[PDB]
Amino acid sequence: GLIVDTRDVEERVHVMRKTKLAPTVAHGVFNPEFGPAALSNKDPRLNEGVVLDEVIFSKHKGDTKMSAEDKALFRRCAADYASRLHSVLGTANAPLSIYEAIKGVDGLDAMEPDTAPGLPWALQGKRRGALIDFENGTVGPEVEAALKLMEKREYKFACQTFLKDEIRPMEKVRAGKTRIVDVLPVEHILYTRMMIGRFCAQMHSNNGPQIGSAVGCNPDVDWQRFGTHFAQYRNVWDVDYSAFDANHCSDAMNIMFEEVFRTEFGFHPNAEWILKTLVNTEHAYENKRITVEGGMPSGCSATSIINTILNNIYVLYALRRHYEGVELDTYTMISYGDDIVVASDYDLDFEALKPHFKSLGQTITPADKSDKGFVLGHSITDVTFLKRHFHMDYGTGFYKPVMASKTLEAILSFARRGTIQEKLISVAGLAVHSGPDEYRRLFEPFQGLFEIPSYRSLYLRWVNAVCG
């Protein structure tokens, strides 16, 4: 987005200044070009002069203003995609009750009881369980008062900026390219789930190419479904965006909310409103208060779904900004936030599409970082999606999600204290698809030290999962 104002205040919001990823026994074996992101300005690994405070907000390079004709085109694309979405999902989009928004419904996980509560609560030393009854699905007076302000369209909030404690390529770490999480107030998440939670549940339950969304998928089971679909198209592309969430422009976010979340599709009128509160935001980082126009905060309850919807509309808009006769059947795609696979039997020129995405504020490049840029003839076995390749398994004849061994090494090389055993079981479920030899190599630093699931047990499990 466009930073329109920066100011200092006495109230100090203590941002992330720690590192909860300890190196494991595996670090010394694999020596990964990956490490924890820098969480303190006094981190020796960063380059001299690197000031994360500057770097971490450099993503806010502006808010692209769109022309009348381009906005009218975007509106048509948003309405055409919305028509497709709602035809699949239905229009039972009435608000969830407070209980259902807290506890979840089929296709929507319950709210987290002990994650960050956001502002102003973070100042007051209050936890989420002190504001909401996650067992009974009720709210206290504080939240109830805010919900009434939201009903009245009178609610205002600040985003709380957290630095993301995660493993990153050591190059990004050296450059201070630490990611931020914008933690919204828990009552804003709550009301958003009230306004659009049934829609989100339906999105999850209907994930697939038809709606262009993989949010809610299970890669172990669904890679077969997605792979067989994309295998039958002549051209497949995997596209990278630069700072996709920060570069969603005000015009595009407002129009998308207006066309997707209409009352004529069953939504309460405040569905559009609460989503629109995401466009112009205020972010709290220590004594800094930074006001931004445009861009999506990461901590909306529906950030992934909203990013996915925008991705779908961006592709239709860009193709239509360059070709005549483009329709939702001219191509197929599936997206997860900024992640995207597009396919088509037409020789679409993604190189030529670069300026049309730029008119939206977005910069697309091939995911292969090729020097020629986009090309034709790539297949589903060439692309990466959710960090996973699409590989045929020969015992079953089914597609399986295969992660890069370098990435698995990095994941296994760090862990927070007292979770190594738990993490190994988790990562084992990702690594089984790399085959027995690599699976063995990946886990050999932990032999005699922790329980390692047998390759056989996880393969037999996966087989029943993908067919049974």
Place this chain on the structure above:
Amino acid sequence: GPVKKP
């Protein structure tokens, strides 16, 4: 053939 240019 493929789609059209405007």
